[PDB]
Design an enzyme around this catalytic site. Structure first.
Site, mmCIF file in Angstrom:
data_model
loop_
_atom_site.group_PDB
_atom_site.id
_atom_site.type_symbol
_atom_site.label_atom_id
_atom_site.label_comp_id
_atom_site.label_asym_id
_atom_site.label_seq_id
_atom_site.Cartn_x
_atom_site.Cartn_y
_atom_site.Cartn_z
ATOM 1 N N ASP A 107 0.417 -0.932 0.317
ATOM 2 C CA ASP A 107 0.177 -0.088 0.091
ATOM 3 C C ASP A 107 0.600 1.262 0.053
ATOM 4 N N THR B 267 -7.548 3.656 -1.358
ATOM 5 C CA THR B 267 -6.432 1.776 -0.905
ATOM 6 C C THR B 267 -8.012 1.124 -0.887
ATOM 7 N N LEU C 267 -13.528 2.002 7.291
ATOM 8 C CA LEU C 267 -12.922 1.316 7.380
ATOM 9 C C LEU C 267 -12.893 0.192 8.783
ATOM 10 N N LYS D 79 -18.648 -1.893 8.063
ATOM 11 C CA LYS D 79 -17.408 -2.202 6.566
ATOM 12 C C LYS D 79 -17.940 -4.096 5.842
ATOM 13 N N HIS E 270 -2.886 11.179 -0.317
ATOM 14 C CA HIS E 270 -2.854 10.649 -1.763
ATOM 15 C C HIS E 270 -4.463 11.013 -1.814
ATOM 16 N N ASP F 51 -24.501 11.380 -23.781
ATOM 17 C CA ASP F 51 -24.677 10.387 -22.739
ATOM 18 C C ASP F 51 -25.445 11.945 -21.766
ATOM 19 N N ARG G 138 -21.391 4.990 -20.965
ATOM 20 C CA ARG G 138 -21.574 4.338 -22.580
ATOM 21 C C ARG G 138 -22.804 5.115 -23.147
HETATM 22 C C1 LIG Z 1 -18.021 -1.556 -16.402
HETATM 23 O O1 LIG Z 1 -18.094 -2.394 -16.737
HETATM 24 C C2 LIG Z 1 -19.568 -3.499 -15.781
HETATM 25 C C3 LIG Z 1 -19.570 -4.732 -16.382
HETATM 26 O O2 LIG Z 1 -20.087 -4.833 -16.995
HETATM 27 C C4 LIG Z 1 -20.757 -2.567 -16.213
HETATM 28 O O3 LIG Z 1 -21.211 -2.634 -16.169
HETATM 29 C C5 LIG Z 1 -23.092 -2.465 -16.083
HETATM 30 O O4 LIG Z 1 -23.865 -1.863 -17.035
HETATM 31 C C6 LIG Z 1 -25.262 -2.328 -17.602
HETATM 32 C C7 LIG Z 1 -25.556 -1.231 -17.952
HETATM 33 O O5 LIG Z 1 -25.340 0.304 -17.829
HETATM 34 C C8 LIG Z 1 -25.938 -2.855 -16.436
HETATM 35 O O6 LIG Z 1 -26.941 -3.178 -16.803
HETATM 36 C C9 LIG Z 1 -28.212 -2.526 -16.891
HETATM 37 O O7 LIG Z 1 -28.614 -3.552 -15.894
HETATM 38 C C10 LIG Z 1 -29.312 -2.378 -14.616
HETATM 39 C C11 LIG Z 1 -29.525 -2.386 -13.668
HETATM 40 O O8 LIG Z 1 -30.569 -3.888 -13.367
HETATM 41 C C12 LIG Z 1 -31.661 -3.897 -12.358
HETATM 42 O O9 LIG Z 1 -32.223 -3.161 -12.766
HETATM 43 C C13 LIG Z 1 -33.625 -2.650 -12.112
HETATM 44 C C14 LIG Z 1 -33.525 -2.422 -10.924
HETATM 45 O O10 LIG Z 1 -34.515 -1.895 -10.437
HETATM 46 C C15 LIG Z 1 -34.798 -4.359 -12.921
HETATM 47 O O11 LIG Z 1 -35.197 -3.407 -13.907
HETATM 48 C C16 LIG Z 1 -33.512 -5.202 -13.522
HETATM 49 O O12 LIG Z 1 -34.846 -6.350 -13.190
HETATM 50 C C17 LIG Z 1 -34.302 -7.535 -14.410
HETATM 51 O O13 LIG Z 1 -34.068 -6.504 -15.486
HETATM 52 C C18 LIG Z 1 -34.133 -7.544 -16.883
HETATM 53 C C19 LIG Z 1 -35.430 -7.244 -17.162
HETATM 54 O O14 LIG Z 1 -35.974 -8.545 -18.583
HETATM 55 C C20 LIG Z 1 -33.346 -8.835 -16.749
HETATM 56 O O15 LIG Z 1 -33.000 -9.258 -17.858
HETATM 57 C C21 LIG Z 1 -32.429 -8.703 -14.795
HETATM 58 O O16 LIG Z 1 -32.020 -10.078 -15.262
HETATM 59 C C22 LIG Z 1 -33.295 -8.159 -13.913
HETATM 60 O O17 LIG Z 1 -33.725 -9.550 -13.477
HETATM 61 C C23 LIG Z 1 -32.348 -5.510 -12.505
HETATM 62 O O18 LIG Z 1 -32.619 -6.045 -11.606
HETATM 63 C C24 LIG Z 1 -30.785 -2.354 -16.211
HETATM 64 O O19 LIG Z 1 -31.886 -1.492 -15.109
HETATM 65 C C25 LIG Z 1 -30.571 -1.961 -17.059
HETATM 66 O O20 LIG Z 1 -31.360 -2.177 -17.770
HETATM 67 C C26 LIG Z 1 -31.917 -1.646 -19.386
HETATM 68 O O21 LIG Z 1 -31.373 -2.414 -20.403
HETATM 69 C C27 LIG Z 1 -32.174 -3.407 -20.205
HETATM 70 C C28 LIG Z 1 -31.185 -4.428 -21.405
HETATM 71 O O22 LIG Z 1 -30.839 -5.247 -20.980
HETATM 72 C C29 LIG Z 1 -33.414 -3.022 -21.071
HETATM 73 O O23 LIG Z 1 -34.205 -4.309 -20.845
HETATM 74 C C30 LIG Z 1 -34.001 -2.164 -19.840
HETATM 75 O O24 LIG Z 1 -34.676 -0.671 -20.349
HETATM 76 C C31 LIG Z 1 -33.061 -1.082 -19.281
HETATM 77 O O25 LIG Z 1 -32.359 0.246 -20.785
HETATM 78 C C32 LIG Z 1 -29.727 -3.120 -17.629
HETATM 79 O O26 LIG Z 1 -29.857 -4.677 -17.655
HETATM 80 C C33 LIG Z 1 -24.949 -3.771 -15.850
HETATM 81 O O27 LIG Z 1 -25.629 -4.748 -14.714
HETATM 82 C C34 LIG Z 1 -23.756 -3.370 -15.287
HETATM 83 N N1 LIG Z 1 -22.981 -4.599 -15.098
HETATM 84 C C35 LIG Z 1 -22.973 -4.553 -13.528
HETATM 85 C C36 LIG Z 1 -22.390 -5.904 -12.739
HETATM 86 O O28 LIG Z 1 -22.245 -3.428 -12.577
HETATM 87 C C37 LIG Z 1 -20.690 -0.920 -16.862
HETATM 88 O O29 LIG Z 1 -21.179 -0.468 -17.967
HETATM 89 C C38 LIG Z 1 -18.827 -0.944 -17.096
HETATM 90 N N2 LIG Z 1 -18.242 0.473 -17.127
HETATM 91 C C39 LIG Z 1 -18.175 1.174 -18.656
HETATM 92 C C40 LIG Z 1 -18.151 3.107 -18.547
HETATM 93 O O30 LIG Z 1 -18.260 1.173 -19.655
HETATM 94 N N1 LIG Z 2 -10.997 -1.938 8.775
HETATM 95 C C1 LIG Z 2 -9.865 -2.176 7.858
HETATM 96 N N2 LIG Z 2 -8.376 -1.312 7.660
HETATM 97 C C2 LIG Z 2 -7.980 -1.729 6.666
HETATM 98 C C3 LIG Z 2 -8.022 -2.875 5.657
HETATM 99 N N3 LIG Z 2 -7.063 -2.490 4.925
HETATM 100 C C4 LIG Z 2 -6.603 -1.504 5.107
HETATM 101 N N4 LIG Z 2 -6.817 -1.130 6.343
HETATM 102 C C5 LIG Z 2 -6.394 0.413 6.625
HETATM 103 O O1 LIG Z 2 -6.897 0.815 5.452
HETATM 104 C C6 LIG Z 2 -5.535 2.431 5.650
HETATM 105 C C7 LIG Z 2 -5.599 2.386 4.193
HETATM 106 O O2 LIG Z 2 -5.944 4.287 4.024
HETATM 107 P P1 LIG Z 2 -5.423 4.864 2.607
HETATM 108 O O3 LIG Z 2 -4.271 4.219 1.981
HETATM 109 O O4 LIG Z 2 -6.309 4.776 1.926
HETATM 110 O O5 LIG Z 2 -5.201 6.137 3.030
HETATM 111 C C8 LIG Z 2 -4.418 1.656 5.972
HETATM 112 O O6 LIG Z 2 -3.462 2.368 6.271
HETATM 113 C C9 LIG Z 2 -4.810 0.203 6.524
HETATM 114 O O7 LIG Z 2 -4.254 0.584 7.615
HETATM 115 C C10 LIG Z 2 -9.431 -3.222 6.436
HETATM 116 O O8 LIG Z 2 -9.524 -4.506 5.468
HETATM 117 N N5 LIG Z 2 -9.994 -2.973 7.102
HETATM 118 CA CA LIG Z 3 -25.807 6.218 -22.079
HETATM 119 ZN ZN LIG Z 4 -3.174 3.079 0.586
HETATM 120 ZN ZN LIG Z 5 -3.211 5.326 2.477
#
Ligand SMILES: *[C@@H]1O[C@H](CO)[C@@H](O[C@@H]2O[C@H](CO)[C@@H](O[C@@H]3O[C@H](CO[C@H]4O[C@H](CO)[C@@H](O)[C@H](O[C@H]5O[C@H](CO)[C@@H](O)[C@H](O)[C@@H]5O)[C@@H]4O)[C@@H](O)[C@H](O[C@H]4O[C@H](CO)[C@@H](O)[C@H](O)[C@@H]4O)[C@@H]3O)[C@H](O)[C@H]2NC(C)=O)[C@H](O)[C@H]1NC(C)=O
Ligand SMILES: Nc1nc2c(ncn2[C@@H]2O[C@H](COP(=O)(O)O)[C@@H](O)[C@H]2O)c(=O)[nH]1
Ligand SMILES: [Ca+2]
Ligand SMILES: [Zn+2]
Ligand SMILES: [Zn+2]
Ligand SMILES: *[C@@H]1O[C@H](CO)[C@@H](O)[C@H](O)[C@H]1NC(C)=O
Ligand SMILES: *[C@@H]1O[C@H](CO)[C@@H](O)[C@H](O)[C@H]1NC(C)=O
Length: 706
Positions: A31, A69, A103, A108, A348, A584, A590
């Site tokens: 760290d 961290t 933390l 947590k 930091h 966007d 996206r």
């Molecule tokens: C980085 O990488 C991550 C990993 O992929 C990306 O994160 C992902 O982003 C996408 C889109 O931004 C996410 O997909 C969406 O999920 C949301 C939320 O899901 C929940 O939303 C509701 C809760 O109130 C609920 O409606 C949903 O319920 C069901 O929905 C459908 C229904 O058929 C079903 O298929 C699901 O299984 C659920 O059971 C759910 O609980 C959702 O709102 C979005 O829906 C949009 O798109 C769908 C089609 O997919 C469409 O039908 C809708 O109209 C709507 O427009 C969408 O599914 C995804 O979950 C994210 N993943 C995680 C784990 O975070 C991220 O985008 C990346 N970053 C960048 C900048 O690229």
């Molecule tokens: N409670 C808790 N503290 C953590 C954990 N991991 C790291 N820390 C503490 O959190 C600090 C990290 O904060 P930072 O680097 O963001 O200022 C470190 O000093 C470390 O001792 C954790 O898993 N649990």
């Molecule tokens: Ca968008």
């Molecule tokens: Zn740190």
């Molecule tokens: Zn630190």
């Protein structure tokens, strides 16, 4: 002879003892290990230096934002942006839960905070044991899964004891032995905070940490595993020297008020006291406008959450406050001088593109090349790297899978280009000819390759209708569903008003007529391709090359092309430019679907207009200055995502130094080419000669400030 005393040995083929089928993978974290430490103090760190010289090393590893961290340590093992995995900061708050996070807190260990899927969970779903020691998220069970061997965080546990603990686990029976391991140390973050990045205590700490890794390597050797283990020595962030003179207190502009709460640090966020009653009811817009440009050379800047630079990816989370603060290097912000721990200590959390926020990365083992130094990369890319080392199918993450293939001896995954999902159609001459009401003062394949020399951008939109409009100076991808250009590509070599012409290939819109634009309204039209190209090039005055643009943004856009672009063509011997509008509105990073697009189409001057939130621009040149953009052997990319704002409050135009504030805005909003791809649904450089893995490396690159 100890491991550090031995010279380099090529581990082309893993040499494993019996009971081992494949080399395990250990993730060792230190760290607060700023990247500058190893650059400068290499001669004082003999163990780490051998790992550098015999493994895969990178000068700078770019961490996530903010540089704390927990968010970064969790971003490493999830490959997700902090806005998506839930852990935004060490101390944060969720309005929808009405609960704070810390933390040192009971909150947590609450699984409702941790989103995504960490690597140990991934290993568990695919029948792979994992043994962790003090990794953020290891104490908590996520998705009802806990690492097969874990330890609840106890900072009192001596470092020497932590190494031996892992060494004891490596000796477990073949059926009960973990294949993935983690290690965490609080140094040199602890010594970094209390005495500063440049101190005797950090040198003493670095030597302490260096010998401790050396203890591990000698221990691996005595077990006969020194040539049978994949080691990834990483860190979460860097360290910057804070100052009392260089600290910002909000009370100076607001007063000793108690209606607002400030999470102090270089990445400050603000939420109201009456929470969650007024978490959304509170208008942050007024406070931000009341806080901008209060000082001649202000070292902080008020940002609404979507108005932050897109490269940061720090908006689409409930826990992130709708009002954030961007600070100059070496500066922190707080409400009152009492809330902060201390002002003149090592800190930091600054911008992740800052020089001293950079982290450490050394890959050593049979799977990594020996003495290979690679270019900088983000920590979200490491998740996919570990999946390949453990033979796991990665959870959906934010890392470009395969972009780190150049690190491995034998790459596991061979990436491919995204298929074109767009419904590509053609636009012939069909609608002649409306009156535009404008005052104007007095074969094909050869011209194609000149405008898109790396291949036309592929349409990743599903399932958007796009037309390809060919001109004599540029090629533009026009959208039929939105009736405006998605992108425009042209080549600008080293040395080469109120009027418009109707493009008979596209359907007429009321917003194409000059009669639509008055001199009073701030909204006007801008060109994607500069008209001052090559007399004057007239096809740039085509209706299909204009986009709705604020007058205030025209100040930045014209200076970008009239001054900077021409200067860059001389420095880089010509540039290939691809530009276009960005939509966007849900600020998720996206491209928006047609559904959300129809919801954000405002109406102005009696006509319906979809106005861009941003404008993207990708500059490409040759790595060899002897070559023009039409004959590059290797590429030189730099992308920008410029915010489309009705005003220049962000820039503090006040003082009227135009050539200064614009470039500072450009440099601040630089972005990965991948970032542009993600936000526009386009794919660049697909016909380029370099391989896919090489192109991923190129598109995920960003320059480090200072
Ligand atoms: C980085 O990488 C991550 C990993 O992929 C990306 O994160 C992902 O982003 C996408 C889109 O931004 C996410 O997909 C969406 O999920 C949301 C939320 O899901 C929940 O939303 C509701 C809760 O109130 C609920 O409606 C949903 O319920 C069901 O929905 C459908 C229904 O058929 C079903 O298929 C699901 O299984 C659920 O059971 C759910 O609980 C959702 O709102 C979005 O829906 C949009 O798109 C769908 C089609 O997919 C469409 O039908 C809708 O109209 C709507 O427009 C969408 O599914 C995804 O979950 C994210 N993943 C995680 C784990 O975070 C991220 O985008 C990346 N970053 C960048 C900048 O690229
Ligand atoms: N409670 C808790 N503290 C953590 C954990 N991991 C790291 N820390 C503490 O959190 C600090 C990290 O904060 P930072 O680097 O963001 O200022 C470190 O000093 C470390 O001792 C954790 O898993 N649990
Ligand atoms: Ca968008
Ligand atoms: Zn740190
Ligand atoms: Zn630190
Ligand atoms: C939110 O939390 C605070 C303290 O935790 C509590 O006093 C308040 O009543 C809570 N409000 C709601 C809506 O539960
Ligand atoms: C933390 O670890 C130390 C060293 O192993 C041990 O002595 C101490 O009892 C532990 N503290 C807690 C909170 O259990």
């Amino acid at each position: 002879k100890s491991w550090v005393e031995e010279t380099c040995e090529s581990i082309d083929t893993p040499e494993c003892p019996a009971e081992f089928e494949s080399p395990p993978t250990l993730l060792f974290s230190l760290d607060g290990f700023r990247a500058e430490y190893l650059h400068t103090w290499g001669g004082l760190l003999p163990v780490i230096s051998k790992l550098k010289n015999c493994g895969t090393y990178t000068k700078n590893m770019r961490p996530m934002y903010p540089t704390k961290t927990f968010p970064n340590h969790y971003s490493i093992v999830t490959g997700l942006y902090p806005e998506s995995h839930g852990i935004i900061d060490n101390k944060m708050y969720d309005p929808k839960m009405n609960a704070s996070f810390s933390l040192k807190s009971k909150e947590k260990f609450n699984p409702l905070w941790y989103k995504g899927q960490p690597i140990w969970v991934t290993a568990n779903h695919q029948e792979v044991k994992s043994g962790t020691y003090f990794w953020p998220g290891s104490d908590v069970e996520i998705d009802g899964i806990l690492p097969d061997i874990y330890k609840v965080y106890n900072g009192s546990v001596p470092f020497e004891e932590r190494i031996l603990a892992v060494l004891e686990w490596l000796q477990l029976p073949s059926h009960e032995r973990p294949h993935f391991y983690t290690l965490y140390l609080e140094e040199p973050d602890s010594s970094g905070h209390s005495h500063g990045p440049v101190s005797s205590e950090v040198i003493k700490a670095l030597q302490k940490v260096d010998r401790l890794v050396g203890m591990l390597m000698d221990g691996l050797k005595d077990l006969g595993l020194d040539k049978c283990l994949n080691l990834i020595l990483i860190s979460d962030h860097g360290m910057e020297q804070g100052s009392c003179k260089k600290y910002v207190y909000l009370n100076k502009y607001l007063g000793d008020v108690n209606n607002v709460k400030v999470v102090y640090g270089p990445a400050a966020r603000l939420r109201p006291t009456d929470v969650p009653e007024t978490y959304y009811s509170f208008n942050y817009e007024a406070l931000a406008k009341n806080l901008s440009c209060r000082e001649p050379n202000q070292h902080f800047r008020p940002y609404l959450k979507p108005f932050l630079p897109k490269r940061l990816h720090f908006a689409k989370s409930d826990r992130i406050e709708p009002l954030t603060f961007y600070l100059d290097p070496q500066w922190q912000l707080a409400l009152n001088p009492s809330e902060r721990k201390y002002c003149g200590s090592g800190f930091h959390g600054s911008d992740n593109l800052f020089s001293n926020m950079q982290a450490l990365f050394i890959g050593y083992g049979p799977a990594f090349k020996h003495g290979a130094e690679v270019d900088s990369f983000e920590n979200i890319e490491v998740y996919n790297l570990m999946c390949d080392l453990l033979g796991l199918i990665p959870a959906p993450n934010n890392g470009s899978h395969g972009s780190l293939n150049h690190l491995l001896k034998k790459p596991i995954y061979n990436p491919s280009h995204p298929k074109e999902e767009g419904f590509l159609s053609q636009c012939p001459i069909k609608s002649t000819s409306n009156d535009l009401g404008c005052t104007c003062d007095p074969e094909d394949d050869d011209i194609y390759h000149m405008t898109v020399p790396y291949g036309r951008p592929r349409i990743l939109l599903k399932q958007h209708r796009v037309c390809l409009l060919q001109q004599q100076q540029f090629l533009t991808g026009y959208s039929l569903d939105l009736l405006m250009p998605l992108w425009a590509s042209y080549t600008f070599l080293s040395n080469d008003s109120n009027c418009l012409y109707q493009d008979l290939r596209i359907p007429l819109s009321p917003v194409h007529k000059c009669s639509y634009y008055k001199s009073n309204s701030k909204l006007s039209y801008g060109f994607l391709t500069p008209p001052r190209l090559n007399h004057i090039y007239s096809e740039a005055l085509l209706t299909s090359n204009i986009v709705p643009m604020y007058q205030s943004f025209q100040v930045i856009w014209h200076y970008l092309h009239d001054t900077l672009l021409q200067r860059y063509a001389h420095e880089r011997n010509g540039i290939n430019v691809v530009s276009g509008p960005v939509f966007d509105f849900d600020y998720d990073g996206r491209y928006d679907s047609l559904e959300i697009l129809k919801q954000n189409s405002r109406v102005i001057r009696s006509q319906e207009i979809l106005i861009p939130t941003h404008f993207f621009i990708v500059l490409t040149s040759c790595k060899q200055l002897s070559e023009t953009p039409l004959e590059c052997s290797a590429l030189e990319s730099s992308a920008y995502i410029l915010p489309h704002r009705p005003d220049n409050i962000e820039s503090c135009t006040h003082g009227k130094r135009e050539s200064s504030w614009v470039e500072e805005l450009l440099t601040l909003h630089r972005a990965r080419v991948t970032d542009v791809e993600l936000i526009t649904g386009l794919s660049f450089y697909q016909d380029r000669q370099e391989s896919v893995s090489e192109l991923l490396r190129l598109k995920t690159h960003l320059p480090i400030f200072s």
